[PDB]
């Protein structure tokens, strides 16, 4: 087994070389540069809407591109599409399998996707010649639970699963186009770049990877956490992303510098993060927690700026509209709230 | 809605109908009994689920007994990490755990040192003391009784438990196995374990499940009344 030993040594020395290059490229910190600018004021955000109707725990939600409609998924076997202005319910889709824990809304507004412990991603046609919502496709290529899914267009979707892989699908043919492998751990979250050329993922191996959709290759790997990564989100610029783990910390990574920039943590906080999101300008970083609260961070100074406390159970999902007017939080108490 | 247009009022009416349908479905689903079935591959889950009702990730089996509808969930196909989805089953009525008596001496194919019975005991300890199941009843089934009778005469139980000091007869060995399994529970007062030996019983395991579920339902009712 001398070949295996020499391969292990070569891999270790390559990792050491990469670490040394990252360290040599590291001059100063984000905090030192940012200390010049004035801090953001205290954030006073209030509940504006309360959406009722789900009769079990809520696991996921996604905003529409019009910043008015949204979709929510609950383990009562229901998908509900809401009108956030009038609080009205537009559609209620019954699910074949009630163990759903992800959902996505197509940018064209014509389709909705959901999946869970059935290892199947279902596609629903909202605009039908009849008056009902129909299933248009079922994608059944995974061997583990579905954790996340995001549309690229009306014909392409990217899913992540518990089989440690991510896959790109052709909806019309129902076949996998590309497979992304390399995590060696349960992949829990996805985040698409604004230009849709790349996407990032976070897995239970406490690592994050950047993939090229066209080439199907892993370009960069980021390792700064010591526990499972539950959520991930691109910076609005497209050159950074934030991760939330079970070690009660959030981190900011840079693609061009290829390393960590800043950490958001507090001694009084010991619970894990379930969801993260950015504001339109990227100045505010919103993270959901297991302590029933959602914290608003200052992305440039790592100083907490506000607290959203209106739920009496775990905050499971977050969402900010495309125009940046409102923020939505889901929870295990079966309620959605719109904060502004 | 005095300030609403005709289309807005029609949309509100549609939303009201959707709310009514959601409420009715939720009330219809509240009368079901949900069971989480756990164990190992060779434990006998298939035999039990066959007796109950005379790559997918979860299998749902529906059956009825005495005007009561039961839903059973099998999660044996999920080879991913259990701690990332076990919380979805918090709030289940009861857990059914299947163990084979005859596998006290056999070793797992994957690991030579590991024994099947100790692996089952480790899994039972992990599930019973889980923080999502601090108040959930457990129904324990011992699945291979006749094979236990055959193997106990030709081989002592001391190979599995080196500290077993008793007669190699079936009754004492079965009592020792049951007490070893029941000693893993730590709450004791909060939760209880139901045990039932099965070889080829006919329409008797369903009655045992019914009795345990009735006890759980009575406890829930007493919690609801506040008399608790």
């Amino acid at each position, epitope marked *: 087994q001398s070949e295996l030993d020499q391969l292990r040594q070569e891999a270790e020395q390559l990792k050491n070389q990469i670490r040394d290059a990252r360290k040599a490229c590291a001059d100063a910190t984000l905090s030192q540069i940012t200390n010049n600018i004035d801090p953001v004021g205290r954030i006073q955000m209030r509940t504006r809407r309360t959406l009722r109707g789900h009769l079990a725990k809520i696991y996921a939600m996604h905003w529409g591109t019009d910043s*008015r409609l949204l979709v929510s998924a609950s383990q009562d076997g229901k998908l509900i599409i809401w009108d956030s202005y009038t609080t009205n319910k537009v559609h209620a889709i019954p699910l074949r399998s009630s163990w759903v824990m992800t959902c996505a809304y197509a940018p064209s507004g014509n389709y909705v996707a959901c999946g869970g412990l059935d290892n199947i991603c279902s596609i629903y046609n909202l605009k039908t010649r009849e008056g009902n919502v129909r299933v248009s496709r079922e994608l059944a290529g995974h061997t583990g639970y579905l954790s996340c899914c995001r549309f690229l267009d009306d014909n392409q979707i990217v899913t992540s699963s518990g089989d440690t892989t991510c896959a790109l699908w052709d909806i019309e043919t129902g076949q996998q186009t590309t497979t992304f492998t390399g995590h060696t751990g349960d992949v829990m979250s996805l985040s698409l770049a604004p230009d849709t050329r790349l996407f990032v993922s976070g897995a239970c191996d406490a690592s994050a990877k950047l993939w090229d959709v066209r080439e199907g290759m892993c370009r960069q790997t980021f390792t700064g956490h010591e526990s499972d990564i539950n959520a991930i989100c691109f910076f609005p610029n497209g050159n950074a992303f934030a991760t939330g783990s079970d070690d009660a910390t959030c981190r900011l990574f840079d693609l061009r510098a290829d390393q960590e920039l800043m950490t958001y943590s507090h001694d009084n906080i010991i619970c894990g993060i379930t969801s993260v999101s950015f504001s339109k300008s990227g100045r505010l970083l919103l993270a959901g927690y297991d302590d029933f609260n959602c914290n608003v961070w200052d992305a440039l100074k790592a100083d907490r700026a506000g607290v959203l406390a209106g739920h009496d159970n775990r905050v499971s999902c977050l969402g900010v509209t495309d125009d940046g007017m409102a923020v939505a939080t889901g929870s295990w108490d079966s309620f959605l709230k719109i904060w502004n | 809605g005095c300030t609403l247009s005709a289309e807005d009022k029609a949309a509100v*009416e549609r939303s009201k109908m959707i709310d009514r349908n959601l409420r009715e479905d939720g009330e219809k689903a509240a009368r079901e009994v949900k069971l989480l079935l756990l164990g190992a591959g060779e434990s006998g889950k298939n035999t039990i689920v066959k007796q109950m009702k005379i790559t997918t990730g979860i299998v749902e089996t529906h059956f009825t007994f005495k005007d009561l509808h039961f839903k059973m969930f099998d999660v044996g196909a999920q080879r991913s990490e259990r701690k990332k989805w076990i919380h979805c089953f918090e709030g289940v009525t009861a857990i059914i755990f299947c163990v084979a008596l005859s596998d006290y001496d056999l070793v797992l194919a994957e690991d030579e040192e590991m024994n099947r019975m100790h692996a089952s005991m480790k899994l039972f300890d992990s599930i019973c003391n889980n923080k999502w199941f601090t108040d959930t009843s457990i129904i324990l089934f011992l699945n291979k009784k006749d094979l236990f009778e055959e193997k106990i005469k030709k081989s002592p139980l001391t190979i599995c438990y080196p500290e077993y000091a008793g007669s190699n007869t079936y009754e004492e060995a079965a009592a020792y196995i049951q007490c070893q399994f029941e000693d893993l529970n730590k709450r004791k007062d909060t939760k209880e374990i139901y045990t039932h030996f099965t070889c080829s019983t006919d329409t008797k395991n369903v009655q045992f499940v019914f009795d345990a579920v009735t006890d759980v339902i009575i406890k829930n009712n007493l919690k609801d009344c506040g008399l608790f």
Partner: single-chain antibody
Amino acid sequence: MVQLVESGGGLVQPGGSRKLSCSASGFAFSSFGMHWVRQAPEKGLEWVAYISSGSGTIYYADTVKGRFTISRDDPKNTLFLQMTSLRSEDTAMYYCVRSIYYYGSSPFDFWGQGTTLTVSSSDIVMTQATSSVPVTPGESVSISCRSSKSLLHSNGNTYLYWFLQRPGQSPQLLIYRMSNLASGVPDRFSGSGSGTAFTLTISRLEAEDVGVYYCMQHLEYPLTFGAGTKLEL
């Protein structure tokens, strides 16, 4: 696959009673509201009655109120209209129209092939000044409709509908809420307006675009149609 077929009609003695029925197939009937729309010979359209999904809400036109009643049979996928004390001006063709109401829907998007009833012998006023426009293929034309009251609601949308009736056929929706194209309409129809004056533009007119154009307001009940505007070669 959507289809609507009506039954009933024929010669009627004055003062008699009949029941019109329509049968639906190819869509979720219980989820749609139902309208009855009347068109007298050589005359424009006139709304009659409306029954909501779930039968919660029912409206009538003041002309037929008390004499006409409307009902649904959801399991059989049927719509009814029982008429009593029929008089001379009830003689017309009766259409059945489906409509669904939620954020972003398209009401009045399918019309049935109505039947003919022959009988022996404030509200918003929508007006179209022009009654005929001579057209030739390849030419752009504009149709104008005017409203007595402003149709712009405080929610930000204007409740104006444009319909087309080809000779010998049923009316077809073209524009809903003054700017939106229907599902199967070519991108040569455009609509615009401001409060009380509205216009419909047909760029690159073709031989298929010949018929009568009707404007409708959906701001409040009763629903009123404008006069026709016929295009001829």
